[PDB]
Ligand binder design. Structure first.
Ligand SMILES: *[C@@H]1O[C@H](CO)[C@@H](O[C@@H]2O[C@H](CO)[C@@H](O)[C@H](O)[C@H]2NC(C)=O)[C@H](O)[C@H]1NC(C)=O
Ligand SMILES: *[C@@H]1O[C@H](CO)[C@@H](O[C@@H]2O[C@H](CO)[C@@H](O)[C@H](O)[C@H]2NC(C)=O)[C@H](O)[C@H]1NC(C)=O
Ligand SMILES: CCCCCCCCCCCCCCCC(=O)O
Ligand SMILES: CCCCCCCCCCCCCCCC(=O)O
Lengths: 434, 434
């Protein structure tokens, strides 16, 4: 069975009406039921929402998000916002289209692997689920402001549409390209959507800096992502599009046309431009140094050491993970982001997998991150030193005192509780406070 | 019942013979059985060993260590070196004396609280136990070279005395002042005792920098430790003793006399000089700036950013912990040490307790650290990114996939193993490699 809906390029549902400027951010333009594999597998209604959002230039535009409605909602109610690693600069790769039933949707890989297990879990807990087309109508992959505002306005639209309490607690999940959009949504939340109440966010494989991810990727096997990211920023930064187009050589012109063309989604992106140099595509090898790109890159980062703006520092419980030898998305800018955030007051539970890559870490931290989000929805995330994980605690995340010490010495140790230590302050228990 | 042995000050066993220069480092000068509470409680023989070591000026001197001999040794055999937080600059506070039976030993608090539970565990696993008088005959508290060489030569003496295989695996434990001596022993091991085979070390509450610990402590409730540390360095640095003595005022002269006097051990040290300023004791407020102390402090640190020498970087499995709000021993120099070591190739499993103090963290990380040392003796310490702990892993240190996801979604997730991810590389399992 083929997609139940027209190609988004051919569907007026995705067009931005001329009166768009008169809708408020988050206001619903229209809605429609949407046949989705996930909605079917959980007996949950699914819908598409057209709604107004704001692009990088601060101009109104219309966008689509997908909402799943759990059969038995949890009380009090929660919204779970799942961010897809769309990783494409073509409109028919969007999450909404890829959630539909059928077999031929070109980016279906981004919604049928771990995505359904993750969105199912949230629905089986009673959470309301939104997943926006975070790249927006301009398909602007890794454009942080574009993704951020679109995700948050997607949540406002979910709240407007199902008339949910203005203070419903929201939680975010995303990996890889989904983690970039997630990271920017929570970064922008305070400044752009202060009325959204965020209980928690779990994200991993995070591209913290657009510039550092480009350098890490260029000339490598996954250089096709560097092409994709250049295409995406240019679609959200028309001054960079204007700077790039006259610099594209004969080959470069055809490369970007291919990466913006219908059906060229994530599976295509990683099967093309392997080992290519983006600089080979353009006459200028000085593009990173010259304006406007040099300034844009200073905007398109969350690392304060590179940013030309004061980076926001979200305070709610956060859970982040990353493969140390990640071969697609570099570990160190994510580590630098975590450190910076922590020195300014963040609550980041940081999880570094030593023997992992981008793909294996996508699963490794999946279950802990959802567990963490379940606790965040209950206001019960564990206490951690920011930028670390929970330390070793007998009976909780490491062997019991009995298992390690045996019964006698475990009773001796237990009975030091309350007795004077050599430092004149009393001993505590083997377990830190819960 | 009073101590079975004379006061160390009155016992020729502790004196350094005139022929000391003809003994090699680690060579046993003499031995004797020693009645110890710990040795009694485990049915294990205990002995004292007199043995040659090297002081900070590179001069031979004699020292005492205490060895416990498990009834049924483990095979292959291991040595467990336990470092005591003696925290005194008086000879009758030494660990050896405090291990003896009786009630009046003045530093007995340093050997009857967690110390017996820790040394018992090692004996019940079949490990050979040494605990040196790491401060040496000059009672030089937090003098790192003095403590390091004394601990390692104590191990050589244990090996010489019980004729143990030259490649017996050694493991180290220590907290607080014990962690400082431990930290310096492993730092010096390669350069000074390359023939010692180290399987692992677990230490916490570590004073990394003598200078930073002084500043952190001075004028606070525990300023008495700052007095003690000044006394200890001066006892291992005679040029600093010569600089200090003519600067001691009428009060200062009596303060240091009290802190060097018989029976003035850890319980006294924390009951005296509360809120005192060390600068008030001396005419000169410029002592940290002036020589020789300024240079000595640059030697008496493990933080490369302060050191005037290339700090060693041990490579064997290490486990370190620290209370983030530690009020006696500052967290940040220990964190800086860990970071520096990690950037140069260390294997440090780093554990930061967020809701803890110096005393509570003394227990919190006790059981994990001994567990870690059991694994290190088996060559089975877990893999960690250096400077972090093991990240969250379902079924191992966090809830099971079944517990978090339920049975269905846990089977869906499990069955992604081996299937292509959206990135064209296959998925792995929920559990990282063991
Ligand atoms: C590569 O092509 C670009 C695209 O035109 C060239 O850009 C122009 O350079 C001239 C001379 O410096 C300027 O007056 C124009 O304004 C530029 N046009 C722009 C901004 O697109 C460029 O000279 C060529 N060479 C390199 C290495 O960049
Ligand atoms: C405090 O007492 C010290 C101890 O003597 C004084 O030190 C001497 O200072 C003179 C003049 O600078 C030198 O010639 C001597 O060599 C110093 N003796 C030493 C090194 O102990 C010192 O002047 C006094 N004042 C301060 C603030 O330190
Ligand atoms: C000339 C360069 C200017 C702009 C370069 C910015 C490109 C950023 C790099 C692309 C991001 C790819 C992220 C990987 C996708 C994923 O892991 O999901
Ligand atoms: C004028 C100052 C020069 C030398 C100052 C060095 C003093 C170092 C500080 C003392 C260390 C105390 C460590 C705490 C003991 C423990 O926690 O076990």
């Amino acid at each position: 069975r083929r997609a139940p809906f027209p190609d988004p390029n051919d569907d007026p549902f995705y067009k931005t009406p001329s009166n768009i400027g008169t809708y408020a951010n988050g206001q619903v333009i229209q809605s429609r039921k949407a046949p989705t594999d996930i909605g079917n597998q959980n007996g949950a209604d699914s819908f598409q929402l057209s709604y107004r959002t704001t692009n990088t230039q601060k101009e109104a535009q219309a966008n689509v998000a997908t909402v799943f409605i759990p059969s038995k909602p949890a009380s009090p109610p929660k919204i779970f916002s799942y961010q897809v690693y769309e990783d494409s600069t073509q409109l028919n790769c969007a999450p909404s289209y890829s959630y539909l039933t059928g077999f031929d949707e070109p980016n279906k890989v981004t919604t049928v692997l771990d995505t359904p297990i993750i969105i199912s879990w949230a629905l089986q807990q009673g959470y309301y689920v939104v997943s926006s087309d975070h790249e927006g109508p301009r398909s602007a992959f890794i454009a942080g402001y574009e993704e951020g505002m679109a995700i948050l306005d997607g949540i406002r639209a979910f709240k407007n549409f199902k008339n949910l309490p203005e203070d419903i607690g929201v939680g975010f999940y995303g990996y890889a390209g989904g983690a970039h959009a997630t990271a920017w949504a929570v970064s922008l939340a305070e400044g752009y959507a202060p009325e959204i109440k965020i209980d928690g966010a779990a994200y991993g494989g995070t591209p913290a800096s657009a510039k550092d991810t480009f350098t890490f990727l260029n000339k490598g096997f996954f250089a096709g992502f560097a092409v994709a990211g250049v295409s995406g920023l240019a679609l959200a930064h028309p001054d960079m599009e204007a700077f790039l187009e006259p610099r594209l050589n004969a080959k470069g012109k055809q490369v970007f046309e291919q990466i913006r063309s219908r059906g060229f989604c994530l599976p295509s992106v990683v099967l093309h431009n392997n080992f290519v140099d983006v600089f080979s595509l353009v006459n200028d090898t000085n593009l990173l140094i010259e304006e406007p790109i040099a300034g844009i890159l200073k905007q398109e980062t969350l690392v304060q050491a590179e940013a030309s703006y004061t980076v926001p520092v979200p305070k709610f419980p956060r859970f982040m993970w990353h493969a140390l030898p990640d071969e697609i998305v570099p570990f160190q800018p994510a580590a630098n982001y975590v450190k910076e955030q922590c020195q300014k007051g963040a609550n980041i539970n940081w999880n570094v997998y030593p023997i992992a890559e981008h793909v294996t870490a996508e699963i490794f931290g999946l279950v802990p991150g959802l567990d963490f989000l379940s606790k965040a929805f209950k206001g019960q995330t564990p206490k951690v030193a920011c930028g670390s994980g929970v330390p070793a605690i007998p009976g909780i995340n490491s062997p019991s005192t009995q298992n390690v010490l045996g019964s006698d010495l475990a009773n001796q140790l237990n009975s030091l509780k309350g007795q004077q230590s050599a430092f004149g302050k009393p001993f505590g228990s083997v377990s830190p406070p819960l």
